[model samples]
Target chain A: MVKQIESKTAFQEALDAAGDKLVVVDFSATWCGPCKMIKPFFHSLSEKYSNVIFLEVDVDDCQDVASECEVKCMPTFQFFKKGQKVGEFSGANKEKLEATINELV
Target chain B: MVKQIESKTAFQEALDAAGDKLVVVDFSATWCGPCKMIKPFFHSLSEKYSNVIFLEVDVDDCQDVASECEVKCMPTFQFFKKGQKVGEFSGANKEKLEATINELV
Candidate 1:
């Protein structure tokens, strides 16, 4: 399932807890159309990745995490593992996103 | 000092980075005459209102922010007190620009 990140500390805790597991963070905003478009796809992917941690971070709700991650737009997916970022990308393209996930996890 | 927003995340940071202060955004373009004309005044207002965060977003340079804000014109101004959009107006009028800032802040 997808977990909504409410704050920087909450995101940090999630990332830290993930540790060696792959943590995929979806940085998005409510007003963003593309973010809305890809959300369903993102949610479904969460269901498929049983060993990965899926996070939903609204830039407005969790500004510090977005800022720390240096997110540029809605639907920016950041992959983290071993307590650090392994890969990231920004867009609504489903296939590329899925491919990246498969490659990393 | 007006900050140039390069990305949506930067704009989001400006909102969160601004803390509880007001954020006045000027969505402009390089080719628009009015956008160029109002740049100096907008920058001047930034100095005058040190408490408010002044942001300059070039529609051409940052299409994501432009599209995300629903910007259609060459010179659009948007105001935010927190994460939510508080006021929005599009024009090249100096009087109205000043008035909106006065009204919000």
Candidate 2:
């Protein structure tokens, strides 16, 4: 299941504990139409890639997370490794998004 | 016309001389599909917002600019003010892209 980041402290803890695993963050907002369209697909990916860490951050709920991630658009996907951001993309392109995850994992 | 930044030097010079205007940059790659999809739209924004400085950086051509901007995705839109990055987003969402531009300008 995809983990939902609820607070700034939780986000920091998640970042610190990321370790050597692939950390995927979906920075999204409820009011964003595109984000809503892609939400289900993002969840399925989490289930498919159980070995990797998947996180969801609602920009409105966790404004701090959105600010820290430098999210300017809805539904930004940020890839991280060893607690450092490595790859990212914005939008809801399922094929490219999946391909990126495949390569990273 | 959209200004294509060929070198790190030119990019820096443009950034330095931007004054109080919004400096909009499109960080893209040649092989990126989404980058191609959004290229024309980005250019149109440049023409529409003459007051805003629009610049494009090819990741392969100017690896330095991509590294400096921390661009991890194709077609990353970054906003800068006074030479400091203020906002950014990744993707090809035309409406949100325009809305952000409107707010900034």
DockQ of each: 0.05, 0.03
Chain B of candidate 2 versus the native chain B: what TM-score?
A: 0.94
TM-score of chain B of each: 0.95, 0.94
Error of 2 at B39 (Å): 1.1
Per model, state how many residue pairs clash: 0, 0
List, residue by residue over B1-105, the lDDT tens digit for candidate 1. 999888878888879988888898888754455676788899899999998999988765676777678764447889999788999887789999999888888
**Which residue segments of model 1 deviate by more than 4 Å?**
B1-105
Best by lDDT: 1
lDDT of model number 1: 0.81
Off by over 4 Å in 2: A1-105
Compared with the true structure, what per-residue lDDT tens digits does model 2 show for residues B1-105?
Answer: 678999999999998989989898888654455677788888888888888999889766786676667665556889888898888987878898889888887
Q: What's the CA error at residue A55 for candidate 1, in Å?
A: 0.2
TM-scores vs. true structure, each candidate: 0.55, 0.51
- Give me the TM-scores for chain A across all models, comma-separated: 0.94, 0.93
Q: Write the per-residue lDDT of candidate 2 for residues A1-105, one digit (tens) a residue.
A: 788999999887887887778888998754455677888998899889878899999765786666667665547899988877889888878898899988887
RMSD of candidate 2 to the true fold?
14.5
